[PDB]
Amino acid sequence: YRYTGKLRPHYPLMPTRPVPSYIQRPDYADHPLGMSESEQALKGTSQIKLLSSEDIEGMRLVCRLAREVLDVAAGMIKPGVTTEEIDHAVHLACIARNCYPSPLNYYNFPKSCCTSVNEVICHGIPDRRPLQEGDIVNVDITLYRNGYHGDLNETFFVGEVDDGARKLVQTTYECLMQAIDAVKPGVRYRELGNIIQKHAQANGFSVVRSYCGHGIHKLMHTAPNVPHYAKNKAVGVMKSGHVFTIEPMICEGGWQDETWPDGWTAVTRDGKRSAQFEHTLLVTDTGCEILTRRLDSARPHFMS
């Protein structure tokens, strides 16, 4: 395998961490290949759940806990800390909140969160590599509580970063917030990518095509599929009670991705950097509720 950049995985990984049986587990947690039968039973449907009020309450709670856990991770970002160390803390913080770390054994993913450094677009696997000054690192947190998933990520700076990094990260965050601002009953899901690419392209960056935002509630990944690039063919119109993520991945160079031999880590083909932000959003009668927002501080961690 020919690496596309300077990043390498750092093995061995620690044995997978167990989750106490008193925490409720998603279906895939105990499937030998991590398959989610509940997801597969809806494969290829474009029909979108309209959430009940109980469902809404379950999403508010899990998404709020998910944010608390991301914040724990943000507090640990510094040169010298390994991504495994961050994952171990995430793992414990999930459990302290009586939640299952949704990534754990999802299609056999080995860890409890994704840590994506520099050229890693998404789904990097926490490992023995210490963060280095000048790195940018995304932590993606997904929690499962009382039958609901909640999902968010942010890109963080490690010590001081270059101007390229700041611009990349700032623009990615703007892309996300500009898409969120357009969310309300009656908007086509396909529109969000027109907004995202327009801003990304205006800043010289590209938009990853192989990974999309998604519905999330009782299932971790479900309808709608939500592309972040322009003139996509996404099916559906937003309605009050829809819940889904927006999670744009933007790249300094080209948009093309490939996957490491590990089956997960997605990297730019050109080895240039990529950044990402994500929220889970509830479409209301008039706009949208950002379920995974910070409740206590105005800005994302990188601006603080």
Ligand code: MET
């Ligand atoms: C290894 S599963 C990680 C999934 C990620 N949290 C997402 O938003 O799709």
Ligand SMILES: [Co+2]
């Ligand atoms: Co996510």
Ligand SMILES: [Co+2]
């Ligand atoms: Co997501």
Ligand SMILES: [K+]
């Ligand atoms: K990255």
